[PDB]
Each structure stands twice: as C-alpha cells, then as structure tokens.
Write a protein that binds this DNA or RNA. Structure first.
Ligand SMILES: [Mg+2]
Ligand SMILES: [Mg+2]
Ligand SMILES: [Mg+2]
Ligand SMILES: [Mg+2]
Length: 81
RNA sequence: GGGACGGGUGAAACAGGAUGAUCCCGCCGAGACCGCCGGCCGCGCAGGCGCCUGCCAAGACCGCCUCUGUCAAUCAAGGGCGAAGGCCGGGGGCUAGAAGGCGAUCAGACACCACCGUAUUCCCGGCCGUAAACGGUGCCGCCCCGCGGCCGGCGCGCGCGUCCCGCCGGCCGCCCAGGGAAACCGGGAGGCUCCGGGCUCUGGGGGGAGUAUGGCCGCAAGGCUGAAACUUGAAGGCAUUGACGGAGGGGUACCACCAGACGUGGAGUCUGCGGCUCAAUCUGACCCAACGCGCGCACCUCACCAGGCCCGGACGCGCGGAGGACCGACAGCCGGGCGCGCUUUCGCGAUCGCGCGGGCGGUGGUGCAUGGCCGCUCCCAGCCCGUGGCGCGAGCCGUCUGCUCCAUUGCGACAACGAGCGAGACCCCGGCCGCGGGCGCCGCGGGACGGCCCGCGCGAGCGGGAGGACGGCGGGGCGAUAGCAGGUCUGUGAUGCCCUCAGACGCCCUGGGCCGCACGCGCGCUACACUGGCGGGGCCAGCCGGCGCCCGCGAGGACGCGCGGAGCCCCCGCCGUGGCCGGGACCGCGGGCUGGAACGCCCCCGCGCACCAGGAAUGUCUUGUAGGCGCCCGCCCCCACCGCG
C-alpha cells in the first residue's frame, strides 16, 4: 500500500546519512542487503526490511536530485566556502 | 396591428379570453413617489431629513489686541415638541392592503402560498401622548498610551501639488496601562474598600400585579399615579464541557445509494415466538442489540402435574441403653408396587436413641447487591502523561479552519517541547521457486518493496504502461479509554442477603407433561415445470475416509477379515402443455431397527391436499463472488428441513 509509518521514515533517515557511501539512488537489492547487514541495523522482520529499503531508495534519489531537509549528509564541504 | 391562449405556483386551481384577450406602438386621465449617485458622508433638541426653480427666517463651527462684566450649572411644579397605528370634521381615490370573500395544503387550516377587496395609506384643521422612542450607558466640568481614517474652518513651508506640518471642532476603528463576574470598555464601564467635584431621577428575592380601589386627563381607545391578602425557594447574568439541530462546510460505507442480480412477504411443511385449553401444558430473552437461541426433550436429562420409599440429622452437652440402642424377614391380605401398612415371632447387635445448640444440601428469589464471561457503543480512530504557557476558575494549548491517507496515515507550520497506547507492525491459511528428508508430502528458507518507465505534485503522494505466480489493505485471529442499572444467581466446591430443611423445594422410584389447537408472525425446506420429469449407461472431488461372503424386492440380518470416495453434468430413449408421467400433504392394509419400554425412525402396495411465479411492504450481494449441486462432523440408544465446515 502507501502506509509509511513514522518508524519507517525515522529509521530510513537515520541509516541513510550514516551510509551514503554504501547505498545507491535506485537499487532495491543493494540497499536491501545493506539494511540486512548487522553493523548498521537490526530489522526483526522481513517485510519491515523491504519497506525500509524502498523508502531509502526514494529518499536517496530525492537527495541526488537536490538536498533534503533533516539529512545531515556532509554537504557542509560544498558550502563551507 | 395580429390571431389563441394568458395569468399564477414548489406543483396546481379560483378570476381573464373569437364581445379579438396576452403581445407591439401612439395618445389621454388621475393620484402617489424621488431611483442608480447614496457613503464606519452630513444636518437637526430629539422624533426625523433626498425632483427643478424662487422666496422667508434660522443655526453650529472657525478667525479676531471687537463689547459687557458673573449675567452661571442642574432641576419638583408648570409649559412646548413628539415615529407608526388610532379618533373627530372636511377633501381626494393610484398603488398596497387590517376586516371580509374565494382557491389550494393539511387529519383539521378559520394560518403560512395564490387571487379579489373595505377602512387606512395622501392633503387641511384639531385630539391622543405612547415605541427594543437603544449607544438597552442622565447633564456640567478636569487629567489621561500609541497608531490610523473621514468632514468643516484657519495658519505655516516648499520644488505649487486640491502636496505635508500643525491648531480647533465633530464622526469613527484598533489598542498598552487600568478596570470588571465575565462578555468587554479604554474620546471610559479608568483616575474608587488607597472607597468624598456639583445637580436630578430610579431600584431593594420571584409571583399576585402594572391587577383592585380612589384621583387627574381624554370624544373614545386609553394614559399618569398606584396597594394588600395570599403564595413560593429559587428566579436571573456572563462564561465552560458535552448532546442535539428540518444549521453551514469537508470526508466515508452494498449491515447506504446509482447500475444490476438473487430473494422474502404468495401456498404445503419443519422449527421458535404470543394467545386458548388443560392436572401440567416448566422457564429466560422483546427494534437494530428477543423469536434452529440458552448444542437432537418416550426413561434420565427436568425444573412442572398425580402418587410413594430413605435419612445419606456431620460434630458438642444432658439423659437412656446390652437384664438388649437401632436395624431385617416367611406365611396371608391391603395395595400400581416394596416388610409401605396390617394378624402373628422369629432374628440382628451399640455401627447408637431422645432433647438442646449446630450443620450438610437445594435447576429455590433477587443479574436493580456482586465476581467472571459475552454483547453493544464500535465493519468505529480515536485516548492520555511530564515540563512549560493562558485563565480567579470549571477549562484551554500541546491534540492543526492547509495538502494527502481506508485510517490522529503522513507532509508542512504553530506557546509549545518531548513521550506513550490504539492503527500499522504481528500470528494462521493460500498461491511461485529452492534445499533437505521421505511409510503418508512435510520441515527450513527466498520472493513484492508504490521497486522500474512515463506524467504531475516543494512534499507526503495521486493516473497510466510494463515485466512478473501474484500489484498496490488476498481471506481470517487479536483487539484501545470510558461506559450500559444490556444478558447470565438454571454452567461450577463463584458468592452476599432472604426461603426450605423429616408428611422436605434434599435424594430415589412409577406414570403424565414440556409436543396439546377456532387464532396473529420470525428464520428455513419443498414446488409451481420442456433452460423439464422418468428409465438406462459413462464419468471426475475436498474437510477426509473400512471392507468381504451369503440371505432378503427392499430396509435390514448371520458369519469373517483389515481395507477404502458423489451429485450437478455428458450420451441414448419415452412423455408432449393436459393441476398431465409437474407436486407429494393426508389416509388404509403390511414388513423391520433402537431400546427395560415406541408415542420414535426406515421400507412396500394403494389414495393422490394446497400450488400457474405471488398486494401494501422488505433483506443480501462485487471473482472462483452470487446462485445452483451434493458431501462430512457436532449434539445423539434411533432421528437433521438446524449449526460449524
Ligand atoms: Mg399618521
Ligand atoms: Mg430607557
Ligand atoms: Mg463610592
Ligand atoms: Mg420584590
């Protein structure tokens, strides 16, 4: 469906800014594998994992198109001048 | 002139029309009225004031080195003005329109809507003297934050615009202090319990009652003034939370609608519900949220009706007792029956008898004394905490008048910040693939996420196309806070208080009843036929699952072993629109099963009821769904038109 509860959004944001290097803007498989990785997160279920991965994909392609509020993605380097 | 309707309403009907209406144009008559400009403009003591032209008197404001010199403020009595309606006497007569009449609507409608229409509405002369006559705020006078608009007059400045800087006067808006019960006022409702500028009027809980009785005024209608007895415990103001609205604005759902489908209410019958009857026909529940529901009533179950055995009276005190407490029996009757009772005489042995206290038990009452479990509100999306802030306070913000979502699901803001429950997540089932194991298909995992493309949208997210087993909440379970005088004391070693307790409401036996039938209605079943009924044959399921041989038309039965699945449908024939071979209620002979016991259930021959698709009224439903077809379990000695599947 389209139910993106608070948990999904908050978690996706949190795991994104700490892993911009290990993710990509449109893949669902590599994002899914990263979320399955234990060093970054612990998803007690499967469907939760898939939903989180999908929201991450949307979030990251939104970023690449342009900056997103609430994400401290190290962009200070481009704007520190 | 022209030729058929016109008027009026939500829709219509009364009045008008070939004697020419409605409609077009032109002329004539009379009487009202003064439009758009028209306003947080203005004038006036208030009531009130809007055509052109002319006349008469008046008024506030500003400007001033004009005059006088306290001449002032407020007021019983008294005087004058005073909307609309109304009255007297005269004029006038077009619009509207009290009264009246008539058509509709309604149960009624003498009212609201339609049409006709008198007084009145207009002018002169004169009475009346009331209005939510309201700023619901008396008049004179002083001080007082800030910003702004409009009107009239005067002055200053310049770059000369009907510019900007001021003064007086008036009409308005917002507002800091302060005030207040608050709404709110702030050009005071401020400067007041820190409670004294001057004058006048009014009020003292609610009704009775602005009534009675007097007086004055008035043609009248009526106005001014104005009690008591008696009665009563609240009546009122401003504000808060809910509920409600024939209020507005946004959303949503086949227990709502649109489009359609299948039905019920029509008959016969099964079952439950009220009424009648009876010895009894035991009782709970009555809109959704009672009525095949409280899991199949010949005995039990079982409570109710007519009759009878037993004590299974625990445990304590007093007395008595083996020189014999209590308990059983042949014959022969009475008795439904039994040593139940009776005419008698044999037994047994303290396991006790009687009285006084005290127990046990009871489908006995109260569900309006309770627990627990369910139902409903709710096929809902809502509910709250800590710190802080606003209010004397009940309370409010957080917890949203924007955009999305099935969803208080989210985005984005905000005297709020930060959390939590519910929702989702979660659990079971199914569909595709892999590994392993394997008497019998069953254990562990992968897979789908609004992920890709295109359009939009800041964003959350919306529409289309793909590829894919499956595409956007696939079917179920769980189920928030708060609550109902909802149901259950007849589910229980769950229970408070009552009532019964040795002719028992305890327990056990024999019968009867819960099923009786002039009547009203609730869930279902069978049919009304040819898109069919009968006869013969062929053939496939799943929750899951037991069979051979021999008798008998069959239903069933005697023996003996472990083995195993249907209706619709399809093919060939008969019948031929006839209440007929559709339908199978009712009744008359007969054969069997369960059981201690048929009133119960199966089979065979004959008889062959209502019924031609069902009035006012009403229910359910979106894919393997409706509908049609059958098959298993539950309760159960026998039996399913019911219920779960
Ligand atoms: Mg008048
Ligand atoms: Mg007054
Ligand atoms: Mg005082
Ligand atoms: Mg009084």
């Amino acid at each position: 469906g389209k139910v993106r509860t608070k948990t999904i959004k908050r978690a996706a944001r949190k795991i994104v800014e700490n892993n911009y290097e290990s993710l990509k803007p449109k893949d669902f498989q590599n994002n899914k594998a990263i979320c399955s990785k234990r060093n970054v997160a612990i998803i007690p279920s499967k469907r939760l994992r898939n939903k989180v991965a999908g929201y991450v994909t949307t979030l990251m392609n939104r970023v690449v198109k342009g900056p997103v509020h609430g994400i401290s993605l190290r962009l200070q380097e481009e704007e520190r001048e």
